[PDB]
Coordinates of C-alpha atoms in Angstrom, one line a residue:
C1 CA 10.7 -9.1 -37.3
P2 CA 13.6 -7.5 -39.2
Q3 CA 15.9 -5.2 -37.1
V4 CA 15.6 -2.7 -40.0
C5 CA 12.8 -1.3 -42.2
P6 CA 12.7 0.2 -45.7
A7 CA 12.8 4.0 -46.2
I8 CA 9.6 3.7 -48.3
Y9 CA 6.8 5.3 -46.2
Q10 CA 3.7 3.1 -46.1
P11 CA 1.6 4.4 -43.1
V12 CA -0.6 1.7 -41.6
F13 CA -3.4 1.7 -39.0
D14 CA -3.9 -1.0 -36.3
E15 CA -7.2 -2.2 -34.8
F16 CA -6.1 -0.3 -31.7
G17 CA -6.2 2.9 -33.6
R18 CA -2.4 3.1 -33.3
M19 CA -0.5 4.7 -36.2
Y20 CA 2.5 3.0 -37.8
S21 CA 4.8 4.3 -40.6
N22 CA 5.0 0.9 -42.4
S23 CA 4.3 -2.8 -41.9
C24 CA 7.9 -3.5 -41.2
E25 CA 7.7 -1.1 -38.3
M26 CA 4.5 -2.9 -37.2
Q27 CA 6.3 -6.2 -36.9
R28 CA 9.3 -4.6 -35.3
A29 CA 7.2 -3.0 -32.5
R30 CA 5.2 -6.2 -31.9
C31 CA 8.5 -8.1 -31.7
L32 CA 9.8 -5.9 -28.9
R33 CA 6.6 -6.4 -26.9
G34 CA 6.7 -10.2 -27.5

């Protein structure tokens, strides 16, 4: 889970219906919870 994410905006949706700007962000958020 990189501490940084690319500027490129790649909105993603999770099976929880949660919205994420990009996959990097997805991993980052999960990393904090883990």
